[PDB]
């Protein structure tokens, strides 16, 4: 059967992890805020001509539970590291998630995509070059997204699968 | 003279039982008054008919979204949100009644009932009451919950009000 990819969506509270995931899976967006405990989703997709199954863990950004991420970082194969382009603190919070992931994997080479979400909003505080530089420094792709307009949503998840493939095909 | 309110709980429309609460108006009068008035429905809206949308065994039962019925809404009698009144009272054990929120100063109508001590919520959620009678009804609600809180039957406040 098709290969399954275990994707994990991480980032600060409110950056749009769930809105991105629900847009990908269910093709809709609501502006209501439903902070996540933990949710899992499945979707089959075609990426670079090859059909596969995305198993997506949508994690809590709720900051008080940072000590409870080890198990899902051990199980996950690739990580969507999400910040919001109008929230500089959420961009600063990226580093700590990547540090946690690198420690669990004991590796600098973990499949990961940096996602700058909410690019539909006019209130930007993180410029594209700043995020591109960080992604380059991490050695990972950077994609700007909007869960509201769907800009970049498929691309961000598909790019993460391409990163997992590159890591598990060498 | 702390007020007392009750919920008559139903499970997919079938009566389960009554839970009653003491509201600590002596320590958190604004927060207690909100919950009291929402329990009577005296503003023309309130808890009657709403559900417990998140039940996590070992931790708490959460409800109070009577505006959207999807866990994102609710409103207080003061406006959609009101400030954290104080954090005098702590989450000391089962039965504690405390305000849900989405960050500082975002109290509305959502609330939770502890089924264990939840001390890591101290200083972030306003404690304002406790179960007085019917704690075993709250305990019976836990088997309709799950790890992430999704419920397997509709747990509703079939009736509610204020006791003498
Ligand atoms: C990391 C997993 N995880 C846990 C958790 C944690 C633990 N521990 C922590 C403590 N350790 C001890 C020190 C050793 C033991 C292990 C174990 N297992 C779990 C769960 C079962 O693993 C899946 C939690 C938890 C809580 C959240 C997110 C993830 C969480 C979370 C998201 S949003 C919120 N919290 C506040 C929320 N806000 C809204 O709903 C806003 C909605 C919109 O605006 C109005 C309305 C709100 O007010 N409440 C009212 C208060 C209880 C609270 N919900 C809630 O549900 O807590 C759930 C839970 C289980 C108590 C905590
Ligand atoms: N304009 C706009 N709003 C967005 C976008 N993505 C999310 N939002 C809004 O931002 C809020 C938070 O989104 P949500 O997906 O719940 O964020 P989260 O990262 O899953 N939060 P948590 O960690 O608490 O689960 C919601 O009001 C949602 O509608 C986006 O791309 N554009
Ligand atoms: Mg979420």
Residue numbers in the entry:
A (entry chain A): 0 to 169
B (entry chain D): 2 to 165
Quote the study that presented this structure, word for word:
RAS family genes encode small GTPase proteins that regulate cell proliferation in response to growth factor stimuli. Here we describe RMC-7977, a reversible, tri-complex RAS inhibitor with broad-spectrum activity for the active state of both mutant and wild-type KRAS, NRAS and HRAS variants (a RAS(ON) multi-selective inhibitor). The binary CYPA–compound complex then binds to active RAS (with dissociation constant Kd2) to form a tri-complex structure in which CYPA sterically occludes RAS–effector interactions. Although neither RMC-7977 nor CYPA alone exhibited any measurable binding to GMPPNP–KRAS, RMC-7977 makes multiple π–π and hydrophobic contacts with RAS in the switch I (SWI) and SWII region once the tri-complex is formed.
